[PDB]
């Protein structure tokens, strides 16, 4: 029914309100398209403009590396952690001490995200690199099933989530391993086309649970956040 | 006290019967020292879930005799059997 604003400049105009509230939205793009940036800004703006805390679940980047790189935009992610408004869930693997044998479920991950949501009273969650869990666990069908289960408990707790996914090509399938077909209600596509010397980045609203949105790709730039400017 | 193991398990259907069975397996493994093997339901100790960065379940963590190890998956006994001779910790 409703949408929460992202406060990402221009995005709330393409989405006609923001991201569908109480659901997870798929942010899919190739490398260096702005996925992690979009995911961090969605959490940062939720904490800064409103007093809604956010949880950041990372599978690849280190929590300090998330904070250290964030300084490039004037965003003190460390200062939000000290005020209890941000929390980075470190779900990155252990080097040469993580062994998985046989079938598995992501119940401990779903319990960890849930516990963080309830302790910090969060309403926004970002899960960076869903593609990375597929790469870390060689059970494509099992991981795909458990993300579907994760999207439901995220929706059950009422938090609005962003799951980033890596892509194969710029113009190609929607996501790698097919998480589009399970997180199928909300899909945002980020691109990054290299024509000669000019690099044009565009964002597109593919699906928004049938709510109204703007069709097509719209150009955005990166100036201490994401700034979309064609409408 | 010499060897300490933690078995983190969910509580979906069938986990109840299975978690008791694998626990009996580890406890029947031959050893001359005392070990614990405490079964930790993931719902009751979330602070512990964070310390070991748990994601996949079931997971058995070798805690006391460093280097710490985590063996996960529903076939974790196969790797418990593999590593058990290595866990010959003297002192």
From Swiss-Prot, chain A:
Changes after translation: Phosphorylated on serine/threonine residues by autocatalysis. Both phosphorylated and unphosphorylated forms exist. Both autophosphorylates and autodephosphorylates. Phosphorylated form correlates with clock speed. Phosphorylated on serine and threonine residues by autocatalysis.
- Where in this protein does the record put region B-loop, required to bind KaiB and SasA? 98-105
General function of this protein: Central component of the KaiABC oscillator complex, which constitutes the main circadian regulator in cyanobacteria. Complex composition changes during the circadian cycle to control KaiC phosphorylation. KaiA stimulates KaiC autophosphorylation, while KaiB sequesters KaiA, leading to KaiC autodephosphorylation. Clock output pathways impact the RpaA transcriptional regulator. KaiC enhances the autophosphorylation activity of SasA, which then transfers its phosphate group to RpaA to activate it. KaiB and KaiC together enhance the phospho-RpaA dephosphatase activity of CikA.
Q: What is the effect of changing residue 35 to H?
A: KM for ATP is 13 uM, reduced hexamerization. KM for ATP is 3.4 mM, very little hexamerization
So where does ATP 1 get bound? 31-37, 72, 207-209, 211, 213
Description of how the protein assembles with itself and partners: Homohexamer resembling 2 stacked donuts rings with a central pore nearly blocked on one side; hexamerization is dependent on ATP-binding. Binds 2 ATP per monomer, at the subunit interface on each ring. The KaiABC complex composition changes during the circadian cycle to control KaiC phosphorylation. Complexes KaiC(6), KaiA(2-4):KaiC(6), KaiB(6):KaiC(6) and KaiC(6):KaiB(6):KaiA(12) are among the most important forms, many form cooperatively. Interacts with SasA, probably as 1 SasA trimer:1 KaiC homohexamer, has highest affinity for unphosphorylated SasA.
Sequence intervals crossing the membrane: none
Binding positions (Mg(2+) 1) = 36
All copies of the KaiC domain together span 1-229
Which family does the entry's similarity section mention? Answer: Belongs to the KaiC family.
What broad taxonomic lineage does this protein's source fall under? Bacteria, Bacillati, Cyanobacteriota, Cyanophyceae, Acaryochloridales
> What domain of life does the native source organism fall in?
Bacteria
| Catalytic-site annotation from UniProt | 60 (proton acceptor in ci (kaic 1))
Q: By what name is this protein known? A: Circadian clock oscillator protein KaiC
- Return the domain comment text from this UniProt entry: In the homohexamer the 2 domains (called CI and CII) self-associate to each form a 'donut' layer. The KaiC CI domain mediates interaction with KaiB, CikA and SasA. ATP hydrolysis by the CI domain causes a conformational change that allows KaiB binding. The 2 domains communicate to control ATPase activity. In the homohexamer the 2 domains (called CI and CII) self-associate to each form a 'donut' layer; the compactness and local conformation of the domains varies over the cell cycle and impacts function. CII has the autokinase and autophosphatase activities, both CI and CII have (weak) ATPase activity; CI has the clock pacemaker role.
Curated annotation (Swiss-Prot), chain B:
The UniProt annotation puts the region (KaiB-like domain, interacts with KaiC) at 6-87
Q: Per its database record, what is this protein's job?
A: Member of the two-component regulatory system SasA/RpaA involved in genome-wide circadian gene expression. One of several clock output pathways. Participates in the Kai clock protein complex, the main circadian regulator in cyanobacteria, via its interaction with KaiC. KaiC enhances the autophosphorylation activity of SasA, which then transfers its phosphate group to RpaA to activate it. In addition to its output function, recruits fold-shifted KaiB (KaiB(fs)) to KaiC to cooperatively form the KaiB(6):KaiC(6) complex (independent of SasA kinase activity).
Q: How does it assemble?
A: Homotrimer with a small amount of possible homohexamer; a protein fragment of 109-380 is also a homotrimer. Interacts with KaiC, probably as 1 SasA trimer:1 KaiC homohexamer; unphosphorylated SasA has the highest affinity. Homodimer. Binds to the B-loop in the CI domain of KaiC; SasA and KaiB(fs) compete to bind to the CI domain. Binds preferentially to doubly phosphorylated KaiC.
Task: Please quote what the entry notes about the protein's domains.
Answer: The N-terminus (residues 1-108) interacts with KaiC, while the C-terminus (109-380) autophosphorylates and is probably responsible for self-association. The N-terminal domain stimulates the C-terminus to autophosphorylate; KaiC does not stimulate autophosphorylation of the C-terminal domain.
Protein's name in the database: Adaptive-response sensory kinase SasA
According to its UniProt entry, this protein's organism is Thermosynechococcus vestitus (strain NIES-2133 / IAM M-273 / BP-1)
Source gene? sasA
From which residue to which, out of the full length, is covered?
Answer: 16 to 105 of 380
């Amino acid at each position: 029914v409703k949408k929460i604003p992202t406060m990402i400049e221009g995005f709330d105009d393409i989405s006609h309100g923001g991201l569908p509230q109480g659901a997870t939205t798929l942010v899919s793009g190739t490398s260096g398209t702005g996925k992690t940036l979009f995911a961090v800004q969605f959490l940062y703006n939720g904490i800064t403009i409103f007093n809604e805390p956010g949880i950041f679940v990372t599978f690849e980047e280190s929590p300090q590396d998330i904070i250290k790189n964030a300084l490039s935009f004037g965003w003190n992610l460390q200062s939000l952690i000290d005020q209890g408004k941000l929390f980075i869930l470190d779900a990155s693997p252990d080097p040469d001490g993580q062994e998985v044998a046989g079938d598995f479920d992501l119940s401990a991950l779903i319990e960890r995200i849930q516990y963080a949501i309830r302790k910090y009273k969060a309403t926004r969650v970002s899960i960076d690199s869903v593609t990375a869990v597929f790469q870390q666990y060689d059970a494509a069908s099992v991981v795909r099933r458990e993300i579907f289960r994760l999207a439901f408990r995220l929706a059950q707790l009422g938090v609005t989530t962003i799951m980033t996914t890596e892509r194969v090509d710029e113009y190609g399938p929607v996501a790698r391993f097919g998480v589009e077909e399970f997180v199928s209600d909300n899909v945002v596509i980020l691109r990054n086309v290299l024509e000669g010397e000019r690099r044009r980045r565009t964002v597109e609203i593919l699906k928004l649970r049938g709510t109204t949105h703007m069709k097509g790709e719209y150009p955005f730039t990166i100036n201490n956040g994401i700034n979309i400017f064609d409408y | 006290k010499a060897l300490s193991l933690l078995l983190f398990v969910a509580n979906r259907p069938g986990d109840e019967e299975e978690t008791a069975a694998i626990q009996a397996h580890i406890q029947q493994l031959p050893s001359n020292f005392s070990f614990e093997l405490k079964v930790v339901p993931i719902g009751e100790q979330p602070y512990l879930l964070e310390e070991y960065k748990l994601v996949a379940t079931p997971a058995l963590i070798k805690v006391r005799p460093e280097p710490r190890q985590t063996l996960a998956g529903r076939k974790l006994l196969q790797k418990v059997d593999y590593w058990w001779p290595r866990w010959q910790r003297e002192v």
